[PDB]
Amino acid sequence: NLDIIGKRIEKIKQEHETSWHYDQDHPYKTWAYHGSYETKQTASSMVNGVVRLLTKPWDIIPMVTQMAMTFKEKVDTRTQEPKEGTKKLMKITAEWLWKELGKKKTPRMCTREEFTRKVRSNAALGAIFNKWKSAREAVEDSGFWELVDKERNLHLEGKCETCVYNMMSRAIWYMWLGARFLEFEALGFLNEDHWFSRENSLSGVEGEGLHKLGYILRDVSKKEGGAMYADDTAGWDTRITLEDLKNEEMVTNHMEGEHKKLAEAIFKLTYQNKVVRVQRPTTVMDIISRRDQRGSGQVVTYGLNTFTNMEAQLIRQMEGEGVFKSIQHLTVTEEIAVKNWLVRVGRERLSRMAISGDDCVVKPLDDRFASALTALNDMGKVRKDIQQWEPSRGWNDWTQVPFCSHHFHELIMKDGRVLVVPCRNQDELIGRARISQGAGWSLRETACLGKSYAQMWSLMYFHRRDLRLAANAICSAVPSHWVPTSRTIHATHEWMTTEDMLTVWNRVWIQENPWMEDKTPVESWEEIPYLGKREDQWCGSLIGLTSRATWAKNIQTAINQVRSLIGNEEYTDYMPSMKRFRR
Ligand SMILES: c1cncc(Cn2cccc2)c1
Ligand SMILES: [Zn+2]
Ligand SMILES: [Zn+2]
């Protein structure tokens, strides 16, 4: 308790010694409270005018227009201790899983060099603004690194002074850039060296672009077994137990020397003991602590969520298959049965899953899995929008399964080749492309963000009539040589390029498609297929509406409207690519 977190608390106390007051009307129940101090400050969602001017029919669709307008009661909940049988199942499975992930990988420290490069190419690290302005300025100043070094030698000493979270079904915990470095130096190898790639982890998808996920689900569907289960957890990050954090820390058993000590300190001092500062409107700053739940960098959060989700789903599979009888207690021969199951079929059972942090798809050996709920509920991983003990609804067709906010279509090209494409309701896609975040956007920067969305649509959603037309319109309206932009884990985004989108389509869906037999490149957009016209409406297309009718016929007008506002620039017409405009 206060021996590990006291120093951090002590230090913040003295920076606001004029204000420190143990408030009596504090709202926290499951968070330990410590004191309050005086502050006074808060980042709303702004409209992208280039995208909105070129999507006029959606100006009257509330599911689009409402997205641009406008639970911290769940972070203040408690998760009961799992039973002894459950704690033993998790320890055996975690020990086995780290071993498997480590067979072809070597834990290693990430470097100042590596960290610096990441700051200079814009990444969502979750730092704050204070002595230096941006991350860019702190990383070039030698002062920073002496603060980093002092903390670093404190961690080797088993102590912490400045690794403090700043709070803001979401909750992002910003830290200062120095604490973010020490986290990256010790644990960044999990992401930098792709420990959760599908090649390495068999269940994972790390590095897989949206164009691979449908093919991966179709491959899981080819396995013999029961329904495909895709159960969402209610507030995954809030249900991470201290038992989970101890199984995650076992990655340090694979480390040596300095690295081992630095990683042990990240887990013990900052993950298994947190200090947080929260804005209350009643405006004070509350200094609160707790031992459990997930509050780490976003990228480490993704890899450890993937790990613990892989562990939980193997255990739910063991329960369905009758490997153990009760979570109350594992007998000695049940332990050896669990171990022997892992050794004999663990890798096969990982390959029946697609896991992206808290998001999973599982094709179990049979449907006993649907009612195998005791371990899942006792680990705290309670399913969303179903009653605790109600059996899971499975999906009979891989093309209906939700994963990473998408579903996937099987689409046959006029030449017989098969595409498996990503899809979601088109209102969600259009509504998201019409939104910017942050201040000080020039017209050029707004246009280049519009162009990023357009190129994404050409590569991923070319099969949606409205998006291919709107993408061609935005690319026609933005100067041809202007570079697509975005402010700041992600798989590589191949739409982020000034390369000819048609040449990218050919390499992504044909040349470098490990699922595609024939490597013959496509020599015209008009060869590339759409979904069915009825399947497009189902997925939220405005095809058929008079609003969409004129918008299409008269798009050249909207394209030229935008061209005039950006100004005298080289513009290309990509609409003639459309069969409708193509004579
Ligand atoms: C994070 C890191 N690597 C892959 C994913 C999966 N994914 C791809 C597109 C949308 C989701 C997520
Ligand atoms: Zn620290
Ligand atoms: Zn669809």
Ligand 1 centroid–CA 491 distance in Å is 5
Q: Is any ligand 1 atom within 6 A of the Cβ of residue 208?
A: yes
Buried b or exposed e, range 466-476, using 16+ CB within 10 angstroms: bbbbbbbbbbb
Q: Is any ligand 1 atom within 6 A of the Cβ of residue 406?
A: no
Q: Do 565 and 450 form a contact (C-beta atoms < 8 A)?
A: no
CA atoms 22, 25, 31, 37: torsion sign: negative
Residue 277, SS3? strand
Give the ligand at the shortest distance from the Cα of 206.
1
Q: Smallest Cα–Cα separation from 373: which of 448, 451, 299, 319?
A: 319
- Check the annotation: does 358 bind a ligand: yes
Q: Smallest Cα–Cα separation from 486: which of 121, 44, 64, 210?
A: 121
Ligand 3 centroid–CA 368 distance in Å is 30
Neighbours of 212 (CB within 10 A): 19
Q: What is the spatial distance between Cα 209 and Cα 447, in angstroms, rounded to a whole number?
A: 24
Torsion of CA 142, 144, 146, 151, to 10 degrees: -160
Beta bridge partners, 280, equal 284
Q: What is the spatial distance between Cα 491 and Cα 219, in angstroms, rounded to a whole number?
A: 20
Q: Is any ligand 1 atom within 6 A of the Cβ of residue 227?
A: no
Q: Do 535 and 542 form a contact (C-beta atoms < 8 A)?
A: no
Q: What is the spatial distance between Cα 98 and Cα 47, in angstroms, rounded to a whole number?
A: 45
Q: What is the DSSP string of 406-459?
A: BEEEEEE-TTS-EEEEEE--HHHHHHHHTEEESS---HHHHHHHHHHHHHHHHH
- Check the annotation: does 211 bind a ligand: no
Q: Tell me how far the alpha carbon of residue 473 is from its chain's centroid.
A: 30
- Give Cβ neighbours of residue 202 (< 8 Å, ≥ 6 apart): 347, 350, 351, 353
Ligand 1 centroid–CA 299 distance in Å is 11
Residue 342, SS3? helix
Q: What is the spatial distance between Cα 94 and Cα 250, in angstroms, rounded to a whole number?
A: 8
Cα-based distances in Å from 500 to 122, 243, 297, 455, 563: 24, 50, 35, 10, 20
Nearest 5 degrees, angle CA 166-CA 167-CA 172?
105
Nearest 5 degrees, angle CA 63-CA 69-CA 75?
100
Q: Tell me how far the alpha carbon of residue 184 is from its chain's centroid.
A: 17
**Amino acid occupying residue 37:** Y
Q: What is the spatial distance between Cα 280 and Cα 148, in angstroms, rounded to a whole number?
A: 30
Q: What is the spatial distance between Cα 55 and Cα 467, in angstroms, rounded to a whole number?
A: 10
- Give Cβ neighbours of residue 368 (< 8 Å, ≥ 6 apart): 226, 320, 321, 322
Q: Which two tokens stand for residue 391?
A: 């059996």
Q: Which two tokens stand for residue 145?
A: 């690194």
Ligand 1 centroid–CA 181 distance in Å is 23
Ligand 2 centroid–CA 150 distance in Å is 9
Q: Which domains are delineated in the chain?
A: 1-38+111-187+241-292 (3.30.70.2840), 49-55+405-566 (no CATH), 81-104+196-238+298-402 (no CATH)
Ligand 2 centroid–CA 178 distance in Å is 9
Residue 114, SS3? helix
Q: Do 575 and 581 form a contact (C-beta atoms < 8 A)?
A: yes
Q: Smallest Cα–Cα separation from 393: which of 159, 227, 182, 219?
A: 227
Beta bridge partners, 36, equal 286
Ligand 2 centroid–CA 438 distance in Å is 30
Q: Smallest Cα–Cα separation from 291: which of 310, 267, 311, 260?
A: 267
Q: Do 410 and 215 form a contact (C-beta atoms < 8 A)?
A: no
Q: Is any ligand 1 atom within 6 A of the Cβ of residue 205?
A: yes
Give the ligand at the shortest distance from the Cα of 208.
1
Q: Which two tokens stand for residue 214?
A: 């449908």
Parallel, antiparallel, or unpaired for β 435-437 and 45-47?
A: antiparallel
Helical spans, DSSP H, in 75-209:
84-102, 112-120, 135-140, 142-156, 177-187, 189-192, 198-201
Q: What is the spatial distance between Cα 11 and Cα 146, in angstroms, rounded to a whole number?
A: 18
Q: What is the spatial distance between Cα 204 and Cα 73, in angstroms, rounded to a whole number?
A: 31
Q: Which two tokens stand for residue 8?
A: 């951090």
**Amino acid occupying residue 61:** I
- The ligand 1 atom nearest the CA atom of 302: 1
Residue 578, SS3? coil
Parallel, antiparallel, or unpaired for β 274-280 and 165-167?
A: parallel
Q: What is the spatial distance between Cα 509 and Cα 212, in angstroms, rounded to a whole number?
A: 10
Tell me which residue has tokens 């590569």: 459
Q: What is the spatial distance between Cα 521 and Cα 488, in angstroms, rounded to a whole number?
A: 33
DSSP tally for the chain: helices H, then strands E: 23, 11
Helix (H) or strand (E) holding 287: strand 284-290
User: What is the residue with the minimal CA distance to atom 11 of ligand 1?
Assistant: 404
Q: What is the spatial distance between Cα 429 and Cα 561, in angstroms, rounded to a whole number?
A: 23
| 8-state DSSP, 229 | B
Give the ligand at the shortest distance from the Cα of 179.
2
Helix (H) or strand (E) holding 61: none
Parallel, antiparallel, or unpaired for β 274-280 and 284-290?
A: antiparallel
Q: Smallest Cα–Cα separation from 487: which of 536, 442, 523, 438?
A: 438
Experimentally, the structure was elucidated by X-ray
- Give Cβ neighbours of residue 63 (< 8 Å, ≥ 6 apart): 425, 427, 428, 431
CA atoms 541, 546, 551, 553: torsion sign: positive
Q: Which two tokens stand for residue 386?
A: 């179903």
Q: Smallest Cα–Cα separation from 106: which of 254, 302, 304, 299?
A: 254
111-118 contact pairs (CB < 8 A, 24+): 111/185, 112/145, 112/181, 114/184, 114/188, 114/192, 115/139, 115/181, 115/184, 115/185, 115/188, 118/184
Q: Is any ligand 1 atom within 6 A of the Cβ of residue 191?
A: no
Q: Which of 201, 208, 420 for a ligand 1 pocket mutation test, highest count of atoms within 8 Å of Cβ?
A: 208
Residue 338, SS3? helix
Residue 344, SS3? helix
Residue 167, SS3? strand
Q: Which two tokens stand for residue 235?
A: 């507030």
3 state SS for 238-268: HHCCHHHHHHHHHHHHHCCHHHHHHHHHHHH
Q: What is the spatial distance between Cα 320 and Cα 371, in angstroms, rounded to a whole number?
A: 8
Q: What is the spatial distance between Cα 122 and Cα 457, in angstroms, rounded to a whole number?
A: 23
- The ligand 1 atom nearest the CA atom of 212: 8
Q: Do 459 and 495 form a contact (C-beta atoms < 8 A)?
A: yes
User: What is the residue with the minimal CA distance to atom 5 of ligand 1?
Assistant: 206
- The ligand 1 atom nearest the CA atom of 207: 3
Distance linking the first and last C-alpha atoms of the chain: 74
Resolution in A: 1.6
- Check the annotation: does 305 bind a ligand: yes
Ligand 1 centroid–CA 189 distance in Å is 18
Nearest 5 degrees, angle CA 13-CA 301-CA 351?
165
Beta bridge partners, 285, equal 37, 279
Q: What is the spatial distance between Cα 393 and Cα 386, in angstroms, rounded to a whole number?
A: 9
Q: What is the spatial distance between Cα 266 and Cα 175, in angstroms, rounded to a whole number?
A: 13
Q: Is any ligand 1 atom within 6 A of the Cβ of residue 354?
A: no
Q: Which two tokens stand for residue 487?
A: 């402010």
Residue 76, SS3? coil
Residue 395, SS3? strand
Tell me which residue has tokens 């590990």: 4
Q: Is any ligand 1 atom within 6 A of the Cβ of residue 334?
A: no
Cα-based distances in Å from 163 to 33, 209, 295, 301, 472: 17, 33, 12, 16, 47
Q: What is the spatial distance between Cα 140 and Cα 138, in angstroms, rounded to a whole number?
A: 6
Q: What is the spatial distance between Cα 473 and Cα 452, in angstroms, rounded to a whole number?
A: 13
Buried b or exposed e, range 46-85, using 16+ CB within 10 angstroms: eebbbbbbbbbbbeebeebbebbeeeeeebeeebeebbeb
- In the chain, which residues are last before a break of more than 2.5 Å from C to the next N? 42, 70, 129, 168, 282, 488
Q: What is the spatial distance between Cα 499 and Cα 432, in angstroms, rounded to a whole number?
A: 24
Helical spans, DSSP H, in 478-566:
501-506, 533-538, 546-553, 555-566
Neighbours of 118 (CB within 10 A): 18
